[PDB]
Design a protein around this ligand. Structure first.
Ligand SMILES: CCCCCCCCCCCCCCCCCC(=O)OC[C@H](COP(=O)([O-])OCC(O)COP(=O)([O-])OC[C@@H](COC(=O)CCCCCCCCCCCCCCCCC)OC(=O)CCCCCCCCCCCCCCCCC)OC(=O)CCCCCCCCCCCCCCCCC
Ligand SMILES: CCCCCCCC/C=C\CCCCCCCC(=O)OC[C@H](COP(=O)(O)OCCN)OC(=O)CCCCCCC/C=C\CCCCCCCC
Ligand SMILES: CCCCCCCCCCCCCC(=O)OC[C@H](COP(=O)(O)OCC[N+](C)(C)C)OC(=O)CCCCCCCCCCCCC
Ligand code: HEC
Ligand code: HEM
Ligand code: HEM
Ligand code: HEM
Ligand SMILES: CCCCCCCCCCCCO[C@@H]1O[C@H](CO)[C@@H](O[C@H]2O[C@H](CO)[C@@H](O)[C@H](O)[C@H]2O)[C@H](O)[C@H]1O
Ligand SMILES: CC1=NC2=C(CCCC2)C(=O)C1c1ccc(Oc2ccc(OC(F)(F)F)cc2)cc1
Lengths: 49, 74, 99, 239, 64, 378, 59, 54, 54
């Protein structure tokens, strides 16, 4: 059956914030985006200069 | 040729994560260093030997040019 | 016979086995090979498709499989030979007829 | 035709981020002025070039006024001679190259504007040449006027040793030894050939820092986007 | 008074210099002793100066 | 439906730039195309800005170039960007070609041959560029290299004087070299677009030399972000030269003005021609030497026909790999030898290196392919 | 309070309009800061060598 | 534009450089010009659609 | 040449010393006129026949 398919373990790849499977990712969503977009924003300020 | 007209593929599953769910550099040194050494060892005696040979024919020819320009004891 | 020592050596040196490829996956696709591929049965074709997908994905990561997972020299079936041989044999007949 | 290449002297501007010693330039200019400028031209350096480098506007105006230069025509239709100003270039000793040869027994003294850049070794080369004049070895002599220098190609030059102890009194009162006079003039000839030196290196530092910032940031952006693919697992599930 | 000619002497009294200076003096009183041979001694001088002025470079600029 | 696939101008951009299906696995050696484009655009801008200040008259020429570096605002940084940018171009070119050779991308015949043309055009451009400052190496380089064409029987001697527009490299030669040098980059840009037009017929090759249709990724964002990173690294290399060693890849003798009497000690072209300059000097006969120098480049057109291996890439081919790296090391030897005076041991090394160049391409690497095949029962 | 990166997101990086205005403000403040800071590093590395350092002697 | 206080040395030199490059820019824009024309095909003297008689 | 001193001289040097330089020079000058004749005629067509709707 297709019910035999279950998603592989991605623990190795995950951010620390989303490791805990019993907690909601939504707490960390505000933060995780902030970090990655800051990198992009910093880059743009540098390129601008 | 557009996406959707490339080729025929059957029964191949692909799981993947959002870049916001994961790290940019997971085990970057931990797994990176050994993989580099493996990659380097794999190609070293294909890549290196000709440049060894260049280095030798170069340093030989350079100081051969120097010796030849000196006067000979006669 | 006697060069079988070198054939086995070359096989591992070449190293397509490290990506879980068989020899006939590495054949450069000309017009004959295209036709040979086109003639493969569902099973043999989808295996080819996956083996390559796997190899390309490994190449993308600059990694190889575990040594247990490498294609053994002895277990490398020449899967494309019967199709390719006949595709070529056919074209040579048309080329003959054309003269 | 053997060859002795110069050693690498530790100049105050040797390093990647090291500027020219501008007080050394100020001295070195005077070594061109007092010693060279009666033999070598330096056509690409004007008196305005000195301002904000080794001299003030007012100092450079005084140095310019000190020299003759032709100008014209006036309304009568004649070519007169006038006191120099900032817009004037450093004046050539002779009216042409053919006149220059005659004054130096056939040999043409090269223009010094780019001599650091136009000779292998640069300031290391010139310094060795100026200080390296010595007595010839046994078995050797050139034509009467061609001197022995071990750093010149072919071992024989057509220039009289131009620098020695106290050939000039310096404006800031530095003891004018032969090696001090050579060091200073080289530092000036470096600036002559490459005025951009100090700005170039300022830009270099700012480039290295921005690249220090942007490369790992852009590299992080790369790994971020690509992380969808680096993570992915495949599965083959035939019926 | 020149710092240069002080240091040229200082460097001259090193093993690599004095051995090259002896090489120079060998052919000095080989060519100036023998009669009519077109061979000279530029080579030996340059060997000596190479070793000397390398050392001179390393500490001349301290006195300036 | 979107206005990326609809709009006639955006359609070309969307298909050749954004939604382009690219192999998942292409390496750093695939960045060099993008970098060649950046080089070309970089040369055009810097070049155009220099041309606002330069003059092609023989008397004022050297002076104008120096006037740029001393009086024109940031003229120096523009000038040395353009000179080192030309080096960066050729670095990018040989890396780009090497990729093609190693991974067998040359099987894309039209793409490849247009490449050969592009190479030859960039060469012609850069040869004539180096003349424009009108220094010693400029003038004497141009004189020796042009005058090789006199070795052609019957016509050669006329041909040379017709290029020159006189009896030596003089007033008319410099002025026309400025005009040709201005126009050619624009011709390059056109041919480069045709180059890609044929590439987008097949899509890209990859490191395996196995078809990648089963695993294509869209060009954006994957390769837009990689190409940005590449561009960044190209700018670093360029600016490291421009701001820390702008004279490193040139020659000093091009800082003294051109003198038709006074010959420089060891006259030579710029570094990126040195390999082929060495090949020229290997053959004792002059016309032979010219035909060898010409065949040292044109042989690129012959590479696809010389392909013997049943596998496309050298990835799975140890013998070819070594022979390839030998061919690279040999080219590095020819560049070194090209820079040397014509004497022992550089004559013999040069001869031996030139023999090995043509031997590697025409005999050894084809043989190696067929040996590899017979080792795989093929 | 949520984390600092999170505060940055909600205030500056969420609306693309604020994201761009952030970049333009930041670019100004970076430019002046970087220039002044890097110049200091350069001129300290070349203390007493520059016209800027020896200017006072002739004024 | 002038590169000075009148039309002089720097103006003539840059006018030569711009005058050289611009025709090539024209050629490009002219190709885009036709690229859009071939979206619709040509108008004709009647100002009535000509699809019925091409 | 775009140098102010030699510029006028170079254009005349074309017309007098350069082989068929005159016919090239005056072709280029009248060719510029022919261009603008062609341009205004081309625009006029567009206006009269309403091709500008494209
Ligand atoms: C002339 C201009 C030429 C331009 C070349 C264009 C290169 C390019 O765009 O491709 C990305 C190309 C591929 O690197 P990647 O995306 O990490 O891929 C790694 C593979 O998956 C293979 O992964 P792995 O598991 O084998 O690990 C390898 C690991 C290196 O392993 C180590 O930890 C050492 O990663 C690298 O190769 C990066 C080296 C940079 C180290 C600097 C520290 C940051 O990056 C580079 O070649 C290095 C550029 C990074 C600059 C960082 C500056 C700080
Ligand atoms: C000149 C300097 C060359 C620098 C090379 C860096 C050394 C690393 C290296 O390239 O060797 C490894 C080797 C392994 O590759 P694969 O078999 O595809 O991968 C197997 C799984 N990882 O990688 C390569 O072969 C690199 C691809 C070849 C690029 C060609 C090099 C370009 C410079 C030479 C110019 C040739 C021009 C010919 C002109 C005529
Ligand atoms: C004379 C005036 C000149 C006019 C020029 C205008 C300059 C204005 C600067 C502002 C630019 C910012 C706009 C922008 O969003 O694009 C930057 C890209 C994409 O970033 P990305 O992280 O994909 O988008 C952020 C999305 N958000 C805010 C909704 C969460 O990020 C990049 O990839 C750019 C950096 C790579 C180099
Ligand atoms: C009265 C004559 C005279 C004076 C004084 C003089 N020069 Fe020269 N210089 C020459 C001549 C003549 C040559 C050409 C030598 C030759 O080609 O053999 C020359 C050549 C040079 C060269 C070129 C060496 C080479 O590699 O070809 C440099 C550098 C140079 N001079 C610098 C100086 C400096 C620095 C000073 C003083 C601070 C100076 N000169 C003073 C006449 C002079
Ligand atoms: C101005 C010079 C050139 C430019 C701007 C240029 C541009 C490009 C670009 C953008 C690509 C796609 C990206 C890549 O794979 O690198 C490409 C691919 C290619 N170019 Fe070039 N190129 C130039 C010269 C050459 C030369 C000299 C050759 C060969 C002699 C060549 C042969 C190829 C080939 C074979 C490919 C396909 C690579 C593949 O799919 O694996 N090009 N070129
Ligand atoms: C493939 C593109 C190009 C290459 C490889 C190239 C190469 C070169 C080289 C090697 C020089 C000599 C640099 C030096 O030693 O100073 C040069 C000079 C010059 N180039 Fe280019 N060039 C290119 C495009 C252009 C374009 C498009 C223009 C003008 C529109 C231009 C204008 C000039 C000018 C005016 C000079 C003389 C100034 C100088 O010496 O820097 N070039 N070029
Ligand atoms: C270098 C300048 C130009 C070139 C090379 C050029 C080229 C062409 C060509 C080859 C055609 C198709 C043949 C024809 O109907 O004449 C065309 C059509 C057209 N051009 Fe131009 N053109 C240029 C300038 C202009 C200008 C200045 C305008 C308007 C202000 C314009 C508007 C049009 C229009 C509206 C058409 C469509 C005519 C129709 O279908 O009835 N063009 N152009
Ligand atoms: C005794 C042990 C010998 C082993 C070590 C070898 C180095 C010792 C020097 C021996 C001579 C070497 O041989 C050296 O080869 C080159 C290249 O062919 C010669 O160069 C000459 O021959 C070639 C032959 O094609 C001509 O095209 C060329 O015009 C001419 O200059 C040198 O004049 C010669 O000196
Ligand atoms: C058009 C392109 N096609 C492909 C690849 C690799 C993967 C697949 C095919 C590329 O990197 C690619 C490309 C090429 C050039 C890029 O930047 C440019 C640089 C110059 C340029 O101008 C011009 F026309 F080439 F002269 C146009 C674009 C950006 C991307």
């Amino acid at each position: 059956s297709h019910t035999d398919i279950k998603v592989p373990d991605f623990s190795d790849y995950r951010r620390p914030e989303v490791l805990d499977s019993t907690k909601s990712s939504k707490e960390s969503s505000e933060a995780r985006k902030g970090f990655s977009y800051l990198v992009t924003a910093t880059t743009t300020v540098g390129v601008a200069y | 040729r557009q996406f959707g007209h490339l080729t025929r593929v059957r029964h191949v599953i692909t799981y993947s994560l959002s870049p916001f769910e994961q790290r940019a550099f997971p085990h970057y040194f931990s797994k990176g260093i050994p993989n580099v050494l493996r990659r380097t060892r794999a190609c070293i005696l294909r890549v290196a030997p000709p440049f060894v040979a260049f280095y030798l024919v170069y340093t030989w020819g350079t100081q051969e040019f120097e010796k030849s320009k000196r006067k000979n004891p006669a | 016979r006697w060069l079988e020592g070198i054939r086995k050596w070359y096989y591992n040196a070449a190293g397509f086995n490290k990506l879980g490829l068989m020899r006939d996956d590495t054949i450069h696709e000309n017009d004959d090979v295209k036709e040979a591929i086109r003639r493969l049965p569902e099973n043999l074709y989808n295996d080819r498709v996956f083996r390559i997908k796997r190899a390309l994905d490994l190449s993308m990561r600059q990694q190889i499989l575990p040594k247990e997972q490498w294609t053994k020299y002895e277990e490398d079936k020449s899967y494309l030979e019967p199709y390719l041989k006949e595709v070529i044999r056919e074209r040579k007949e048309r080329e003959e007829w054309a003269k | 035709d053997l060859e002795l290449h110069p050693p690498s002297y530790p100049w105050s501007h040797r390093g990647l981020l090291s500027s020219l010693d501008h007080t050394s330039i100020r001295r070195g200019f005077q070594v061109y002025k007092q010693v060279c400028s009666s033999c070598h031209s330096m056509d690409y350096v004007a008196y305005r070039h000195l301002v904000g480098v080794c001299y003030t506007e007012d100092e450079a105006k005084a140095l310019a006024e000190e020299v003759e230069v032709q100008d014209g025509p006036n309304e009568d239709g004649e070519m007169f001679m006038r006191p120099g100003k900032l817009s004037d270039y450093f004046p050539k000793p002779y009216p042409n190259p053919e006149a220059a040869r005659a004054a130096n027994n056939g040999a043409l003294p090269p223009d010094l504007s780019y001599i650091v850049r136009a000779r292998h070794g640069g300031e290391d080369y010139v310094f060795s040449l100026l200080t390296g004049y010595c007595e010839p070895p046994t078995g050797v002599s050139l034509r009467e006027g061609l001197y022995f220098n071990p750093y010149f190609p072919g071992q024989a030059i057509g220039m009289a040793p131009p620098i020695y102890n106290e050939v000039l009194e310096f404006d800031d009162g530095t003891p004018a030894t032969m090696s001090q006079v050579a060091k200073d003039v080289c530092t000036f000839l470096r600036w002559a050939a490459e005025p951009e030196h100090d700005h170039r290196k300022r830009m270099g530092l700012k480039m290295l820092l921005m690249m220090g910032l942007l490369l790992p940031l852009v590299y992080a952006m790369k790994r971020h986007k690509w992380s969808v693919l680096k993570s992915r697992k495949l599965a083959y599930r035939p019926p | 008074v020149d710092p240069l000619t002080t240091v040229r002497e200082q460097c001259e009294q090193l093993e690599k210099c004095v051995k090259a200076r002896e090489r120079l003096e060998l052919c000095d009183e080989r060519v100036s002793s023998r009669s009519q041979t077109e061979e000279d001694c530029t080579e030996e001088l340059l060997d000596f100066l190479h070793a000397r002025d390398h050392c001179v470079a390393h500490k001349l600029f301290n006195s300036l | 439906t979107n206005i990326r696939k609809s709009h006639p101008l955006m359609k070309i951009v969307n298909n050749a730039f954004i939604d382009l299906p690219a192999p998942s696995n292409i390496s750093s050696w695939w960045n060099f195309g993008s970098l060649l484009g950046i080089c070309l655009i970089l040369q055009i801008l810097t070049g155009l800005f220099l041309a606002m200040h330069y003059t092609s008259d023989t008397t004022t020429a050297f002076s104008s170039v120096t006037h740029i570096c001393r009086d024109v605002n940031y003229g120096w940084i523009i000038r040395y960007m353009h000179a080192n940018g030309a080096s960066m171009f050729f670095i990018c070119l040989y890396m780009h070609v090497g990729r093609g050779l190693y991974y067998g991308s040359y099987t894309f015949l039209e793409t490849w041959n247009i490449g050969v043309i592009l190479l030859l055009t960039v060469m012609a451009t850069a040869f004539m560029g180096y003349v424009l400052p009108w220094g010693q190496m400029s003038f004497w380089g141009a004189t020796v290299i042009t005058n090789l064409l006199s070795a052609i029987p019957y016509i050669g001697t006329n041909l040379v004087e017709w290029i020159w527009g006189g009896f030596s490299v003089d007033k008319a030669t410099l002025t026309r070299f400025f005009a040709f040098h201005f126009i050619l980059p624009f011709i390059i840009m056109a041919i480069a677009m045709v180059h890609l037009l044929f590439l987008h017929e097949t899509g890209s090759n990859n490191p395996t030399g196995i078809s990648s249709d089963v695993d294509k990724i869209p060009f954006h964002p994957y390769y837009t972000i990689k190409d940005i990173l590449g561009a960044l690294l190209l700018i670093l290399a360029l600016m490291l030269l421009v701001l820390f060693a702008p004279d490193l890849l040139g020659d000093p003798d091009n800082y003294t003005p051109a003198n038709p009497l006074n010959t420089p000690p060891h006259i030579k072209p710029e570094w990126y021609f040195l390999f082929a300059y060495a090949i020229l000097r290997s053959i004792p006969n002059k016309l032979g030497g010219v035909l060898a120098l010409a065949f040292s480049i044109l042989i690129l057109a012959l590479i696809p026909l010389l392909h013997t291996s049943k596998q496309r890439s050298m990835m799975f081919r140890p013998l070819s790999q070594c022979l390839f790296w030998a061919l690279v090391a040999d080219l590095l030897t020819l560049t070194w030898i090209g820079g040397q005076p014509v004497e022992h041991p550089y004559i013999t090394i040069g001869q031996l290196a030139s023999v090995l160049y043509f031997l590697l391409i025409l005999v050894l690497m084809p043989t190696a392919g067929t040996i590899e095949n017979k080792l795989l029962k093929w | 309070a949520p984390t600092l990166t999170a505060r940055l997101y909600s205030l500056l990086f969420r609306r693309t309009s604020t994201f761009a205005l952030t970049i333009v403000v930041g670019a100004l403040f970076f430019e002046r800061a970087f220039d002044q800071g890097a110049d200091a590093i350069y001129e300290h590395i070349n203390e007493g060598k520059l016209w800027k350092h020896i200017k006072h002697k002739y004024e």
